[PDB]
Write a protein that binds this ligand. Structure first.
Ligand SMILES: COCCN1CCN(c2nc(SCCc3ccc(OC)c(OC)c3)c(C#N)c3c2COC(C)(C)C3)CC1
Lengths: 46, 1033
C-alpha cells in the first residue's frame, strides 16, 4: 500500500523522464538523422 | 462476424468475466513452485554395502546392476560412482519429455529386467531406486541447543517422529532423511572376545538366534480338536527390545553362570547406522531432512503446512531441540509472488497511468481496468488445464505478457480517438470503421506474434523445458487477447464513452501535459523534415541499415553466451577437500575454522553454516566436508558486496590462506534440479581402455591444459578422488587354514568387526531398527589393531590375525566413477567473474580436444542442456521467423513484402545487444526470450504501419507522401501507448536487485532501445522499401 504511493510520485516522474531522454534521442539525433543528405542507391540490378 | 457481436452489449462485458471467474478458480487449482519439473528425468539407484572397500564395491554391486542395462528407454547417460563407504549411486538420466513415472518403473524393468544375474546380495543389502530430481524443498535441519542429545540422538528422533508425519503433509512426495535412525551398535571388544574364546561369528550367531522373532503360533490353533474352548496366540522370543535385553544375550552354557552376557564382551549402546556424516550446524550437532516436493508442486501450501507441522512438534521436543531451515524455496518464492502479483496489478494501474498521460478520463479510460486482468487470469486458467505451474517462468511469463495485452485494447482506443480527438465525430463512427480497418489486422496481429513462439513450445531439453513454460504462457496470453479484443473491446469502445471536443488533445488540462501534448507532436512536426527528409533520397539510408547489422553481427558472437545466471539463492555450498586419507576428525577440524570463518568474517551476511562433514557434493569419504552456508534476505544483505559471488570470492581467497585443504566455496546453479555447482560439469569418457594411470594423467594433463588458463576457467577441479592408500591385508590363507581356522571364521571376523555388519532387526519404542556388530573404535584404528583380532581354530584355541595375515599398503581410488559400463573421471569448474560459460565451455573444448583418441570428453548435467541450447536456440530463429517470413505473404498478399517487414527484426536485436553489455550481462536463455519479446515488438508496430498502408490504398487512396503524413504522423501515438505500458512494467525491476532480476532488466532496457528503433527507425524502413523495393518489385 506504500508502493501505490511510490507509483503515485515515482510513476509521475519516471514516466516523463523516459519520455524526456527519448526527446534527447529523437530530436537531438533527429537533427543528425538529417545531417546525412545524399544518394547511394544500389540499383545495379534495377 | 465479431462485428455481428458488437451490438449485443452485455454479451461482451461479462465473457471477460467468464475467463476471469474460471481464472478465479485458477487461484484455487494451480500448484506454485518456483522451479517446476524441468530437469531430464533421472533415477538414482542408491545401493549400500557397509564397511566395504571401493575397488570391489563396483564389482560386488555396481558392475552387476550396470550389466543389465540393455538399451535404456530414451536414455542420455548412465553414470555410477562407487566409493569407500560402500555407497553406489547409479544415475540413469533419461531423455526429457520421457515419463519419469514410467522411468522409475522401467529402471526397475532394466534392473528388474534381469535381476538374478545379480549375485543376489546386491538386493539383499537394500537398494533404493528413486527419481532423484536433486532439487529439494526445505532441507530442514534439527539441532540440539544445549548439548545433551548427540547427533544420532537427534537423527533417530527425527526419523521416529518427524519423517513419517512430514512425508504425508500434502505436497511432499518424498522425504529424504539424514543420516539414519538409531541402531543397536554392538561395539565388540576383542580383548574380551579372546577372554571367552569367541569370534565375531558367535557374537553374530547368537544375535541371529536369541534376537529373533519366532512365529510360535496359537493355542487352539487351526484346526482344533473336537472339544475346544481356548484360543490364544503364543508369544515366543520377541525381537529383543532394549540395550539391556541385548546385554543378557547368551553366548554359551554358563558354569561361570552369571550367564555369559553379550554385555560382557560387547559394549552395547544405541547409535546411528553410519557415521560418515557429521552435520554440525553452527558447530553444533544436527540431523536433517531434505524434502522433495511432489508433482503437484505447490511449494506455498506445503511450506505453509510444514512450518505449521513443525510448530505442532515444538511441544514434543526433548531438551533443547531446535528446528532451523538452512535451505528453502519459499523466502525466495513468497515475496517474488506477492510483489509480482501486486506489480502485475501495479502494471494494471500503470496502464491506467499510461492513459492518464493520454486520455485523462474516467469512463472511457476504465476499459483496461477490465481488459487487462482477463488476459491475466485466463493465463492462469488455461495453463491450469494444460499443467503449468506458477513459478518464475509463468510469473515472468505474465510480466512479458503485459506487452502482448496492450497491443490490442489500447491500440483500438486512439484508433477510436482518431475520430474523436482528431476529427470530432461520435464513437459509432469509430466503432465499426476503425475496427474494420484492423479486424483483418488482428487476424495477423494474433498470427505473427504467436508465430515466433511456435517452435520453442515443441522443442526438447531443459532449454525446451524453459521455453514451454514461456511459450504456451505467451500463446495463452495471445489467444486470450484476440478472443478478448474481438469481444470485450468493441462494447467498451461504443457504449459508456464521453463526447470530447475537436482539436483538444488535453491542452487546457493539468499543466505540464498541455504544453507538451503539442510539443511532442510539434517536435514531430520538426521531425517532419525527418519524416520526409529520410524518405526522399533513400540511397544513403540503405547503408545505414547495414550499420545496424554490422553492430548486430559483431556484438553477438562477442556477447558472452551463458546459459543461466547465478541466482542469489540465499545459500551457497562450501566444499572441503583434504589429503587422500584424511580423517573425519581432521575434516571436522577444518569445518571448525570454516564455520568460525563464516561466523566472524561474514556474520553480517551468513545466516548459518550447516556443515555436513564427510558427505560432499562431488565426492564422499572422510577427507571431504561440505557446508550449506545460508544467507539472509536482501534487505539484510545490501549491495554488490553481500551477494553470493562477492562472498564466495572472499571465501575462496581467504581459504587459500587456510592450510591443509583445497577448500573451494561455490554457489548452487540457477535451477537446483541439475547441478552440484554452477558453471559447467566436464565429464570424461573411457574411449579406448587406457586403464587408470593415463586415465588419471590425461586428466592431470587436463589440469595441465585447462587449469593453466586462470583468467577464464576459474577453479577447474576434478570430482573423482585422488588415489588414496588402501590397506591390503594378505590373509596368508594357507596359514589361515593350517593353523586350524576355517577362513569363514576369518572373513566374518575381519569383515564384521572392522566392517560393521547388519545382523537383524530389533524393536525400539515399537519401531524396527537395525543391529550392527562392529569393533569398538580404538580396536580398529591402526595396522596394530590387526594383531588384536582373535579367531578360533578347529580345536577351540585362539589365533591372532598377526600370526598369519601379512598386511601391506597399496593404491586405490575410492570414487570409481563409471559411465554406462566405462570407468570415468568427472571434472568440475566455473567460469570467470564477468564472463560466461560459453566462453569457458568452448574454452574447455579448445582444451578437451587436445587429447588424442582414447579418453574422450562428455558434456552433460547442466552441460547437456547448454550443449542442446547451442544446437537449437539461435537455430530457433530460423524456423520461427521463416514462418513469420511466410505469415506476411498471407497478410500482405505478395512475396516481396516479406523482403521488407522481415527487416524490422534486427532493429531491436541490436536494441538488446546494447542493453546487455551496457550493464554487462550475457547471452543466456532469458536474453533470447528478451529478443523474442523484442522481435515481437518490432513486427507489432509494422502492422499499424504497413497493413495500414494496405488499408489506405483501399479506403483512403494514398501513395507514399499522403500515407506517411497520416500513417506515421498519427498512428505513432498508440505505439507510445504500448511503450509506456510494457517497458515501464519493468520499472519496479530496474531498481530491483533481489530475486534475480538482473538479466531481466536487459530485456526491459533492450526493448526500450528496441522501441527507440521503433520510434525513429522502424517507422521508415518498410516505407524506405516503398521507394526501393516497391520501386523494384
Ligand atoms: C548423504 O547425503 C546425500 C544428499 N545430498 C544432497 C542434499 N544435501 C543438502 N543437505 C542439506 S541439510 C542436510 C541434513 C543432514 C543432517 C545430518 C547429516 O549427517 C548424517 C547430513 O549429512 C548428509 C545431512 C542442505 C541444507 N540446508 C542442502 C543440501 C544441498 O544443497 C542445498 C542448497 C539444497 C542445501 C546433502 C547431500
Amino acid at each position: 500500500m506504500l508502493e501505490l504511493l511510490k507509483s503515485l510520485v515515482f510513476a509521475v516522474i519516471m514516466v516523463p523522464v523516459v519520455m524526456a531522454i527519448i526527446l534527447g534521442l529523437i530530436y537531438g539525433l533527429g537533427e543528425v538523422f538529417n545531417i546525412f543528405s545524399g544518394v547511394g542507391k544500389k540499383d545495379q540490378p534495377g | 462476424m465479431p462485428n455481428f457481436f458488437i451490438d449485443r452489449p452485455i454479451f461482451a462485458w461479462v465473457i471477460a468475466i467468464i475467463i476471469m471467474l474460471a481464472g478465479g478458480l485458477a487461484i484455487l487449482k494451480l500448484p506454485v513452485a518456483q522451479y517446476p519439473t524441468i530437469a531430464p528425468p533421472a533415477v538414482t539407484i542408491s545401493a549400500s554395502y557397509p564397511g566395504a572397500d571401493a575397488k570391489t564395491v563396483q564389482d560386488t554391486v555396481t558392475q552387476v546392476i550396470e550389466q543389465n542395462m540393455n538399451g535404456i528407454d530414451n536414455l542420455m547417460y548412465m553414470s555410477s560412482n562407487s566409493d569407500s563407504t560402500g555407497t553406489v549411486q547409479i544415475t540413469l538420466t533419461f531423455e526429457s519429455g520421457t515419463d519419469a513415472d514410467i522411468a522409475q518403473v522401467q529402471v526397475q524393468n532394466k534392473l528388474q529386467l534381469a535381476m538374478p544375474l545379480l549375485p543376489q546380495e546386491v538386493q539383499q543389502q537394500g537398494v533404493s531406486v528413486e527419481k532423484s530430481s536433486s532439487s529439494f524443498l526445505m532441507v530442514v535441519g534439527v539441532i540440539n541447543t544445549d548439548g545433551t542429545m548427540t547427533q544420532e540422538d537427534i537423527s533417530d528422533y527425527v526419523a521416529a517422529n518427524m519423517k513419517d508425519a512430514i512425508s504425508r503433509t500434502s505436497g511432499v512426495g518424498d522425504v529424504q532423511l539424514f543420516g539414519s535412525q538409531y541402531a543397536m551398535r554392538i561395539w565388540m571388544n576383542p580383548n574380551e572376545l579372546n577372554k571367552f574364546q569367541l569370534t565375531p561369528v558367535d557374537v553374530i550367531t547368537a544375535i541371529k538366534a536369541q534376537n529373533a522373532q519366532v512365529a510360535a503360533g496359537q493355542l487352539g490353533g487351526t484346526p482344533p480338536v473336537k472339544g475346544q474352548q481356548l484360543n490364544a496366540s503364543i508369544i515366543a522370543q520377541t525381537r529383543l527390545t532394549s540395550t539391556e535385553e541385548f546385554g543378557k544375550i547368551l553366548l554359551k552354557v554358563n558354569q561361570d553362570g552369571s550367564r555369559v552376557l553379550l554385555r560382557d564382551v560387547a559394549k552395547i549402546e544405541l547409535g546411528g547406522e553410519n557415521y560418515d556424516i557429521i552435520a554440525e550446524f553452527n558447530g553444533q550437532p544436527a540431523s536433517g531432512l531434505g524434502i522433495k516436493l511432489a508433482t503437484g508442486a505447490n511449494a506455498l501450501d506445503t511450506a505453509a503446512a510444514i512450518r505449521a507441522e513443525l510448530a505442532k512438534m515444538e511441544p514434543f521436543f526433548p531438551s533443547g531441540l531446535k528446528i532451523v531451515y538452512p535451505y528453502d524455496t519459499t523466502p525466495f518464492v513468497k515475496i517474488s509472488i506477492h510483489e509480482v502479483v501486486k506489480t502485475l496489478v501495479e502494471a494494471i494501474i500503470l496502464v491506467f497511468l499510461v492513459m492518464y498521460l493520454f486520455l485523462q478520463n474516467f469512463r472511457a479510460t476504465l476499459i483496461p481496468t477490465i481488459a487487462v486482468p482477463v488476459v491475466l487470469l485466463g493465463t492462469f486458467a488455461v495453463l491450469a488445464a494444460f499443467g503449468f505451474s506458477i513459478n518464475t517462468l509463468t510469473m515472468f511469463g505474465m510480466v512479458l505478457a503485459i506487452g502482448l495485452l496492450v497491443d490490442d485494447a489500447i491500440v483500438v482506443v486512439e484508433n477510436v480517438e482518431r475520430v474523436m480527438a482528431e476529427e470530432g465525430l461520435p464513437p459509432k463512427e469509430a466503432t465499426r470503421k476503425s475496427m474494420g480497418q484492423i479486424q483483418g489486422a488482428l487476424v495477423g496481429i494474433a498470427m505473427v506474434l504467436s508465430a515466433v513462439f511456435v517452435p520453442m513450445a515443441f522443442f526438447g531439453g531443459s532449454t525446451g523445458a524453459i521455453y514451454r513454460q514461456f511459450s504456451i504462457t505467451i500463446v495463452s496470453a495471445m489467444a486470450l487477447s484476440v478472443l478478448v479484443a474481438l469481444i470485450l473491446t468493441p462494447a467498451l469502445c461504443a457504449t459508456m464513452l464521453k463526447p470530447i471536443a475537436k482539436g483538444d488533445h488535453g491542452e487546457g488540462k493539468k499543466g505540464f501535459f498541455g504544453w507538451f501534448n503539442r510539443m511532442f507532436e510539434k517536435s514531430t512536426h520538426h521531425y517532419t523534415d525527418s519524416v520526409g527528409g529520410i524518405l526522399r533520397s533513400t540511397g544513403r539510408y540503405l547503408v545505414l541499415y547495414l550499420i545496424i547489422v554490422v553492430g548486430m553481427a559483431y556484438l553477438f558472437v562477442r556477447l558472452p553466451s551463458s546459459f543461466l545466471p547465478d541466482e542469489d539463492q540465499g545459500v551457497f555450498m562450501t566444499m572441503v577437500q583434504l589429503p587422500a586419507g584424511a580423517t573425519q576428525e581432521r575434516t571436522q577440524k577444518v569445518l571448525n575454522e570454516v564455520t568460525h570463518y563464516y561466523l566472524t568474517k561474514e556474520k553480517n551476511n551468513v545466516e548459518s553454516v550447516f556443515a555436513v562433514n564427510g558427505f560432499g557434493f562431488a565426492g564422499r569419504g572422510q577427507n571431504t566436508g561440505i557446508a550449506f552456508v545460508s544467507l539472509k534476505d536482501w534487505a539484510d544483505r545490501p549491495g554488490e558486496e553481500n551477494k553470493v559471488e562477492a562472498i564466495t570470492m572472499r571465501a575462496t581467497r581467504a581459504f587459500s590462506q587456510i592450510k591443509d585443504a583445497m577448500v573451494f566455496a561455490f554457489n548452487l546453479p540457477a535451477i537446483v534440479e541439475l547441478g552440484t555447482a554452477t558453471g559447467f560439469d566436464f565429464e570424461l569418457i573411457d574411449q579406448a581402455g587406457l586403464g587408470h594411470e593415463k586415465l588419471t594423467q590425461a586428466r592431470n594433463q587436463l589440469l595441465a591444459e585447462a587449469a593453466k588458463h586462470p583468467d577464464m576457467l576459474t577453479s577447474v577441479r576434478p570430482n573423482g578422488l585422488e588415489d588414496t592408500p588402501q590397506f591390503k591385508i594378505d590373509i596368508d590363507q594357507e596359514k589361515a587354514q593350517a593353523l586350524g581356522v576355517s577362513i569363514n571364521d576369518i572373513n566374518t571376523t575381519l569383515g564384521a568387526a572392522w566392517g560393521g555388519s547388519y545382523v537383524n532387526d530389533f524393536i525400539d519404542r515399537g519401531r524396527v531398527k537395525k543391529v550392527y556388530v562392529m569393533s569398538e573404535a580404538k580396536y580398529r584404528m591402526l595396522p596394530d589393531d590387526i594383531g588384536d583380532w582373535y579367531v578360533r581354530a578347529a580345536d577351540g584355541q585362539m589365533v591372532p590375525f598377526s600370526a598369519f595375515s601379512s598386511s601391506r599398503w597399496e593404491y586405490g581410488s575410492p570414487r570409481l566413477e563409471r559411465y554406462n559400463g566405462l570407468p570415468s573421471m568427472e571434472i568440475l569448474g566455473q567460469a570467470a567473474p564477468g564472463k560466461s560459460t560459453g566462453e569457458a565451455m568452448e574454452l574447455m573444448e579448445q582444451l578437451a580436444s587436445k587429447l588424442p583418441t582414447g579418453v574422450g570428453y562428455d558434456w552433460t548435467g547442466m552441460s547437456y542442456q547448454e550443449r542442446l541450447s547451442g544446437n537449437q536456440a539461435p537455430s530457433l530463429y530460423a524456423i520461427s521467423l521463416i514462418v513469420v517470413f511466410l505469415c506476411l505473404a498471407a497478410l500482405y498478399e505478395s512475396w516481396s513484402i516479406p523482403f521488407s517487414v522481415m527487416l524490422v527484426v534486427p532493429l531491436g536485436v541490436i536494441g538488446a545487444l546494447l542493453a546487455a553489455t551496457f550493464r554487462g550481462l550475457t547471452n543466456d536463455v532469458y536474453f533470447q526470450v528478451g529478443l523474442l519479446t523484442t522481435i515481437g515488438l518490432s513486427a507489432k508496430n509494422a502492422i499499424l504501419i504497413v497493413e495500414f498502408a494496405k488499408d489506405l490504398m483501399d479506403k483512403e487512396g494514398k501513395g507514399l507522401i499522403e500515407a506517411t503524413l497520416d500513417a506515421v504522423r498519427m498512428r505513432l501515438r498508440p505505439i507510445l501507448m504500448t511503450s509506456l505500458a510494457f517497458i515501464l512494467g519493468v520499472m519496479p525491476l530496474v531498481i530491483s536487485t533481489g530475486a534475480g532480476s538482473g538479466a531481466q532488466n536487459a530485456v526491459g532496457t533492450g526493448v526500450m532501445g528496441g522501441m527507440v528503433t521503433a520510434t525513429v527507425l522502424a517507422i521508415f524502413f518498410v516505407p524506405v522499401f516503398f521507394v526501393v523495393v516497391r520501386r523494384r518489385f
